[PDB]
Amino acid sequence: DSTECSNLLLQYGSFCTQLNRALTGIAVEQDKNTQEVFAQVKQIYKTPP
Amino acid sequence: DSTECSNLLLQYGSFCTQLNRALTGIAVEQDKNTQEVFAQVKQIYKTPPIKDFGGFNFSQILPDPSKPSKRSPIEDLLFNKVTNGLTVLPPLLTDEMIAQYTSALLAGTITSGWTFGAGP
Amino acid sequence: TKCTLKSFTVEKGIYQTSNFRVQPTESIVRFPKSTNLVKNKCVNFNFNGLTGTGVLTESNKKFLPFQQFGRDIADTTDAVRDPQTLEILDITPCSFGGVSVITPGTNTSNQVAVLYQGVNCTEVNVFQTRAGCLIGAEHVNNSYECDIPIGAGICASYQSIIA
Amino acid sequence: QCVNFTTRTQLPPAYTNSFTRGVYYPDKVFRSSVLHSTQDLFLPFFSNVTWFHAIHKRFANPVLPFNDGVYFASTEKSNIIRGWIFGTTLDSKTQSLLIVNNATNVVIKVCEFQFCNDPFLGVYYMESEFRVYSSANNCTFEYVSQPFLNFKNLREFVFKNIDGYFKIYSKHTPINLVRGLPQGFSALEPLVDLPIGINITRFQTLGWTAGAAAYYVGYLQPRTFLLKYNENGTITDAVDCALDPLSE
Amino acid sequence: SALGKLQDVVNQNAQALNTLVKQLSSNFGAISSVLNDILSRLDPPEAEVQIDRLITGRLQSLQTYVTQQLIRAAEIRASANLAATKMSECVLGQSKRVD
Amino acid sequence: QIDRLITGRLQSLQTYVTQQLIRAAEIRASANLAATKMSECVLGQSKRVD
Ligand SMILES: *[C@@H]1O[C@H](CO)[C@@H](O[C@@H]2O[C@H](CO)[C@@H](O)[C@H](O)[C@H]2NC(C)=O)[C@H](O)[C@H]1NC(C)=O
Ligand SMILES: *[C@@H]1O[C@H](CO)[C@@H](O[C@@H]2O[C@H](CO)[C@@H](O)[C@H](O)[C@H]2NC(C)=O)[C@H](O)[C@H]1NC(C)=O
Ligand SMILES: *[C@@H]1O[C@H](CO)[C@@H](O)[C@H](O)[C@H]1NC(C)=O
Ligand SMILES: *[C@@H]1O[C@H](CO)[C@@H](O)[C@H](O)[C@H]1NC(C)=O
Ligand SMILES: *[C@@H]1O[C@H](CO)[C@@H](O)[C@H](O)[C@H]1NC(C)=O
Ligand SMILES: *[C@@H]1O[C@H](CO)[C@@H](O)[C@H](O)[C@H]1NC(C)=O
Ligand SMILES: *[C@@H]1O[C@H](CO)[C@@H](O)[C@H](O)[C@H]1NC(C)=O
């Protein structure tokens, strides 16, 4: 919550945007991985009673 | 172009050599990838002039003679639908040569099936 | 190439060894004294306190009367207005390029060719390729297998060095 | 000479919507076909802009704060609005800024004017009446320039004072709307930069009959805008980065 | 959105280049991001410190760019190996592998 | 002092993101392998040995 620290951090540019974008890419990649592995059928089949 | 900056940068050693070597490795790796994907045949096969394939139509995937780029209509649509010390190196294989490789693969798989991939 | 590779024997191939920079020749200091403007050359420009190094060419961009300098997407100054005469000049960066040496094995020959990447041949057996300017290789109309890759469909081989 | 106006009619000042007005060029740099994000003192979109009238008997000359900057809009016909007063105490104790546009030229003076309570100009039915200040002792800056100027004319101005620099931005628009601000976008070109270097916290707008005129006062806040530059280098659209989540 | 994968790769590479060029505008705690301004405004004992701050910031930016370039190169190499496998097994022969 | 703390924490965060990206590449390769096994072993009978 330090305003002075954030003001000094703004001098370094878009490092924070790069790190957030990379983490967001990893986070969506995990969901894409789960879709690729498990969501390969569009019909929900059920066993007979 | 600052001489003093370069003199101070020389104190840090061979970081620049490492970065240039890594970028060079990536740049040659892209050409190696293109060779591995497209240059799998050493014979440039061509389709016969008469397109008598028993009713099968391949006009949308064979190269168009009317186009100067010698691309297929599908390939032409694909090319239309894709839009301070930095340099961009051109790829080793140009787009027309990659299209020629795909044309050779298409001609081989149409006229010869899978036989051309395993031998003559 | 021997210096870069740290070896006295160089294997056949292309090796990026150095860089070329078209060095600045004159200084043009135009404020609203005014040193005589020089175009189409790599000069150090100082226009109304904005300084840099570049080639000043004619521009087709129609500026609004209050605007003086021009920036691209990447916030680099690529257009400027001359203060003396209200004309628009494009600032093209001075040519820089990788210098690559194309050679066969030292067991075979000591002949080399130089590729200036992304540099036109008028700004440096001289041949113009899409990759850059190639000096020391004789261009032939025949097509062979690729021995030393140059780029943009161009390859080099030893038979003298041909491209 | 000073004259008290004692025939006014009491009425509260009005308020209206800013819409997408008040955008000015942040710098003198040409940009073409690009989207540029800038953080500067801007007027917020769809904000509450104060509306003052001059109609007959309304003559709205109150004392307004300046704060960080002032956006001044004018729905004007027949040239009643003539200038502005800037300062802190508006007397001889401090140093004040005078901007006037009479029948010939635009005059900017930085002096310690002993201002009247109701400074004004006059047109006889020719200009033969001027009652703004009673004295001017210490003058540091003078600048004489060209004349800047149903409601037919729209005048937009932006006044800012940063680092001793007074930035005035202007835009002139032909309109045919009867009562309010038209809905649209128009980027304000920079008009003048004055090295006045004085403290400004209060400002003033400059029997008898009042001509039909209306003006609007808005206040600037530090915020980010996304500006769109076309192929001709003209700002054609803007986005307020802190207005709503869609524009954010 | 049919060709999103190639446009995604092009956009990522262009965005990395734009970020790398944009990082030159940052001073990284120095008084200015322009080397000429520092060399013309300060004496060499303190200009050396300011240039050192600019050098370490730009070197960190360049190393970061090379690091994500290498990671993307590994991803593209894996995709290209997959594409070569599909070219060998689907185009040059008939594959019994499901999907 | 704040600048020293900022550069240390930024170096730590960049390092963490770097190993996160490397582990993401490894997990993506494993997930691609798992999708291949799901397609070829579960949805069909595979002639591939082991
Ligand atoms: C193969 O398919 C192509 C395209 O699907 C056919 O070309 C069409 O021919 C008709 C009549 O000549 C034209 O009206 C269409 O405009 C053509 N389409 C295109 C895209 O050019 C072609 O005739 C088919 N048969 C053969 C033997 O090539
Ligand atoms: C017009 O009215 C204003 C406001 O009443 C007058 O200003 C006053 O001047 C007297 C001078 O003795 C002061 O004592 C008051 O304090 C002032 N009032 C304010 C609100 O500042 C002004 O003098 C009048 N003009 C003329 C020409 O008489
Ligand atoms: C503007 O402010 C006035 C009072 O200052 C208030 O009555 C009015 O509702 C406000 N309008 C908007 C749109 O906020
Ligand atoms: C306008 O003001 C200037 C400066 O006070 C003065 O010289 C000029 O005569 C004025 N014009 C008229 C028409 O009074
Ligand atoms: C301002 O004017 C007063 C009287 O007119 C004078 O005493 C004072 O010295 C002046 N100050 C300056 C800075 O000129
Ligand atoms: C400007 O004036 C206001 C009130 O008159 C005061 O609070 C402020 O400190 C002044 N600023 C400067 C820089 O003199
Ligand atoms: C830009 O200017 C050209 C003339 O140079 C004009 O034809 C075109 O319509 C203009 N575009 C816009 C968006 O104003």
Residue numbers in the entry:
A (entry chain B): 745 to 793
B (entry chain A): 745 to 827, 856 to 892
C (entry chain C): 299 to 330, 529 to 620, 641 to 675, 691 to 694
D (entry chain A): 14 to 69, 77 to 145, 153 to 176, 185 to 241, 257 to 298
E (entry chain A): 943 to 1041
F (entry chain B): 992 to 1041
Publication passage describing the model:
Given its crucial role in the viral replicative cycle, the spike protein represents an important therapeutic target and is a critical antigen in host immune responses. All emerging variants contain defining mutations within their spike proteins, with multiple mutations clustering within the receptor-binding domain (RBD) impacting both ACE2 binding and antibody neutralization escape, while mutations within the highly antigenic loops in the N-terminal domain (NTD) across these variants reduce antibody neutralization. Given the rapidly changing mutational and antigenic landscape of the SARS-CoV-2 spike protein, a structural understanding of spike protein mutational effects and the discovery of broadly neutralizing epitopes is of importance.
The resulting maps were obtained at average resolutions of ~2.6–3 Å. All mutant spikes exhibited slightly higher affinities for immobilized dimeric Fc-ACE2 when compared to wild-type. We did not observe major differences in spike protein expression across the variants, and all mutant spikes tested demonstrated marginally enhanced ACE-2 binding potencies relative to wild-type. These complementary assays demonstrate that the totality of mutations within each variant S protein enable slightly enhanced ACE2 binding, suggesting a contributing factor for the increased infectivity observed for these SARS-CoV-2 variants. Superposition of local RBD-ACE2 complex models revealed no significant structural changes. These structural findings confirm that mutations outside of the RBD do not modulate the positioning of ACE2-contacting residues at the receptor interface via allosteric mechanisms.
